[model samples]
Target chain A: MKKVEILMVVDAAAALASRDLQSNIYLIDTNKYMGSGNEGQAELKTACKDGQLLCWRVVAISPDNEVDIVEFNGQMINDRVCIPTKQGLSGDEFWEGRVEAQGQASTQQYNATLSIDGSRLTFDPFLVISL
Target chain B: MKKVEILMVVDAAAALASRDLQSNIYLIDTNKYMGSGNEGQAELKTACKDGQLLCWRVVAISPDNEVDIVEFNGQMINDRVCIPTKQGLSGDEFWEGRVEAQGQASTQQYNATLSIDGSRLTFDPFLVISL
Candidate 1:
């Protein structure tokens, strides 16, 4: 069976706390939900820096598993990349994500998770700050 | 059937980039190594801040596979946890790891990987810095 494909482009800087370095990528298969009205949601939690972009791909598992919300933790760079497929979600249904560095000396950490059984898809991305 | 288990502890603050909060945990089954004289060696990389402890566990896979090196990109705190099992590697050979935040305002992101067939289970964990 075919699997749903997701292509995510995160701020190389914000993803690494604005360190301006390339980060690693993680692919997850989610089957949990926090509540209703938030199905297929992806969250990215990172230090707030404004204007950082962390983009991803989504496929509908069915007509009911469509994409809904998109939230950012730090900043989103203008003219960023955001591509979603209409093929919907595929069997062996899974999620694919990528995090890259933006520039130099910018430390950023973001998180993203999907909530199943919810009406919409949510994303929460943020950074890890130092005291 | 037994498996290699690894318990990891990360700075709560550093893990969340000094948010003084907690982070999620990840368990991986590694079968790759980077080099020699470092079998079963685990690495932790994050934003450099003294008194930050991110501990983990290691199990030998064979007579040649043993914990050899321990490296840290950031500073570690006292009273840390370090437990190593001597059951060598378990069948269905896999790796388990965890990352938890310690305290307040410490953002640390560490990356780790095992180099298989390299005579050393070298780990390379690092922080995601912003630009």
Candidate 2:
């Protein structure tokens, strides 16, 4: 299985006061993401048929904040295409998911929420499913 | 310059009510120190003469807690032997410092504290200072 690691860059200090959590978030595809310009739009293109695994890590959470990719609220959480993976502990870490293989291509837009203690912050990023 | 990377494995779920945070915390030096047997004593030995940089990252903070290396409440925070390093985001990340490059040998024990939201927890770890 292939693995894709996405780095979530967050303006954590701004996130505490901002209701628009999406604006305070940026997703960087460490594999394909190459610059700071278009970090928020870095598309995650994967081969669903190959059982690709997608993992997320927080690259930067500023002004002293502990951030975790707690939950993904979307259609991808089901067993049909995607499933959340667990670490040695009971909590969650890297998420493993695959899209339904199609003759052409598919796109999935999902909101990735972060947990700071118990407070929640949400950000929407795109996932491109293809061959 | 040489660098030492330390991994802190914490039991965040049990830490909420546990006063003995030291037992709940384990430090793993991703260096000469190896194995799951003795992570708490993973010594940080460095050539203080060559400006050794000691950095830290939490390998595991269980049960979905966002953890960060917030403060070092010991002698390691000074310019004499060691100092803290900051990332571009204006918060603490890795710590860099050098020993006095002692004539013979010496050992220094310090407490490395972690931050979860605003709550603080600490663990006692050692640094083996030598040539």
Question: Considering only N, C-alpha and C atoms within 3 Å, which residue pairs clash in candidate 2?
Answer: B81-B98, B82-B97
lDDT of 1 by residue, B11-94 (tens): 111223332211222222111111111122233223322332222343221112223224332321122321221222332222
Clashes of 1: 100
List the candidate 1 regions with Cα displacement exceeding 4 Å: A1-81, A86-113, A116-121, A124-131, B1-81, B84-113, B116-121, B124-131
Top TM-score model: 2
How well does each candidate superpose onto the true structure, as a TM-score? 0.21, 0.45
Number of the top-ranking candidate, with DockQ as the measure: 2
Assess the local accuracy of residue B59 in candidate 2 as a C-alpha lDDT between 0 and 100: 32
Taking chain B only, the TM-score of every model is 0.25, 0.70
lDDT at B9 for candidate 1? Answer: 21
DockQ of 2: 0.05
